């Protein structure tokens, strides 16, 4: 079971992590990979992951929105030039969350989907959320720094480099989100999902989560849920997708 990769990484941090300062235990440089074949959706079972949050927050970023009032009014907790902005309007001057950016900055997402369709074998289908000229971003920068899509044998795969991740909450959430982005984009482009590959720089556990994490990691994982994309109407762009287009089947977390 691939959740073991997550649990082993947690065990590793608990047993051999460094102490650095809120304190943490940490290691540097880790990888986990999850198959998305046969509708597998790597939503962790050893502790319930906020699925509705994953979905709404991904669709929100894909709309390029930056106003957490949208999310709040959907049961999910101005944010600045966070992910969606960088994804969809890279290099634009960021003003306010209530403002318009159509035709400003580089739409890396549109560019990635186009490349997937015209040149699926491309090695340059990269999307970056890291802009060192954006001082606002740079004072509280994205944890998930960059990702790459790959098409091989009709399967869309994704690799994401995460500079820092908390194992307790953030990392499981992020596995879900990028897995869901791959599934969403696979559907949009007529492909089947392949794999999500997660690369981590700093991987840390918070001290106040130690006790709970060590109970969690003796639980045997359960088979991952399945995720089906069944749009309620036509979807020609990624911002068009709605929460309801996704049926989560067999999710049974401890």
Question: Is 205 annotated for ligand binding?
Answer: yes
Is 143 noted as a catalytic residue in this protein?
Answer: yes
Question: Is 164 annotated for ligand binding?
Answer: yes
Strands 18-20 and 24-35: antiparallel
Question: Is 206 annotated for ligand binding?
Answer: yes
Told to check if 205 binds Cl ion by CB under 5 A, we report yes
Looking at 143, 175, 183, 185, which residue is catalytic? 143
Torsion of CA 151, 156, 162, 168, to 10 degrees: -160
d(CA 234, CA 27): 44
Binding map of Cl ion across residues 31-70, x = CB under 5 A, - = no contact:
----------------------------------------
Task: Spell out the alpha helix ranges (H) of 150-238.
Answer: 170-188, 210-216
Q: What is the CA radius of gyration of the chain?
A: 18
Told to check if 40 binds a copy of itself by CB under 8 A, we report no
d(CA 47, CA 223): 13
Q: Among all chains, which residue has been given the structure tokens 């969809």? A: 88
Best CA proximity match to 60, nearest among 198, 243, 186: 243
Binding map of Cl ion across residues 208-227, x = CB under 5 A, - = no contact:
-x------------------
Q: Among all chains, which residue has been given the structure tokens 């962790």? A: 44
d(CA 190, CA 193): 10
Told to check if 3 binds Cl ion by CB under 5 A, we report no
How many residues sit in the footprint of a copy of itself (CB under 8 A)? 41
Told to check if 182 binds a copy of itself by CB under 8 A, we report no
Told to check if 165 binds Cl ion by CB under 5 A, we report no
Question: Is 235 annotated for ligand binding?
Answer: no
Told to check if 174 binds a copy of itself by CB under 8 A, we report no
CB atoms closer than 10 angstroms to residue 136: 12
d(CA 126, CA 175): 18
Stretch that binds Cl ion, among 40-48, 70-78, 167-175, 189-197 (CB under 5 A): 167-175
**Residues at the annotated binding site?**
123-124, 163-166, 174, 204-206
Q: Which residues are part of the catalytic machinery? A: 143
Note the residues at the interface with a copy of itself (CB under 8 A). Answer: 18, 20-21, 26, 28-29, 31, 33, 90-91, 105-106, 108, 111, 121, 123-124, 126, 128, 130, 132-133, 141, 145-146, 148, 150, 152-153, 157, 159, 161, 163-164, 194-195, 197, 199, 201-202, 204
């Amino acid at each position: 079971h691939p959740e073991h990769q997550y649990l082993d990484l947690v065990k590793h941090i608990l047993e051999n992590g460094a102490r650095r300062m809120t304190g943490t235990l940490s290691v540097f440089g880790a990888t986990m990979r999850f198959s998305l074949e046969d509708n597998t959706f790597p939503l962790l079972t050893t502790r319930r992951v906020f699925y509705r949050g994953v979905v709404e927050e991904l669709l929100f970023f894909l709309r390029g929105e930056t106003d957490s009032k949208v999310l709040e009014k959907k049961g999910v907790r101005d944010l600045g030039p966070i992910y969606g902005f960088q994804w969809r309007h890279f290099g634009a001057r960021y003003e306010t969350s209530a403002s318009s950016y159509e035709g400003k900055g580089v739409d890396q997402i549109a560019s990635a989907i186009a490349a997937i369709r015209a040149n699926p074998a491309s090695r340059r289908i990269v999307v970056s959320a890291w802009n060192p000229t954006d001082l606002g971003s740079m004072a509280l920068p994205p944890c998930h720094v960059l990702f790459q899509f790959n098409v091989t044998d009709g399967k869309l795969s994704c690799a994401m480099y995460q500079r820092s991740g908390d194992m307790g909450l953030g990392v499981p959430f992020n596995i879900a989100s990028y897995s869901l982005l791959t599934i969403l984009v696979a559907h949009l482009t007529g492909l089947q999902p392949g794999e999500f590959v997660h690369f981590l720089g700093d991987a840390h556990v918070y001290l106040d989560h130690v006790d709970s994490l060590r109970q969690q990691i003796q639980r045997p994982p359960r088979a991952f849920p399945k995720l089906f994309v069944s749009p309620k109407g036509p979807r020609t762009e990624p911002e068009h997708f709605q929460y309801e287009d996704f049926e989560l089947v067999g999710y049974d977390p401890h």
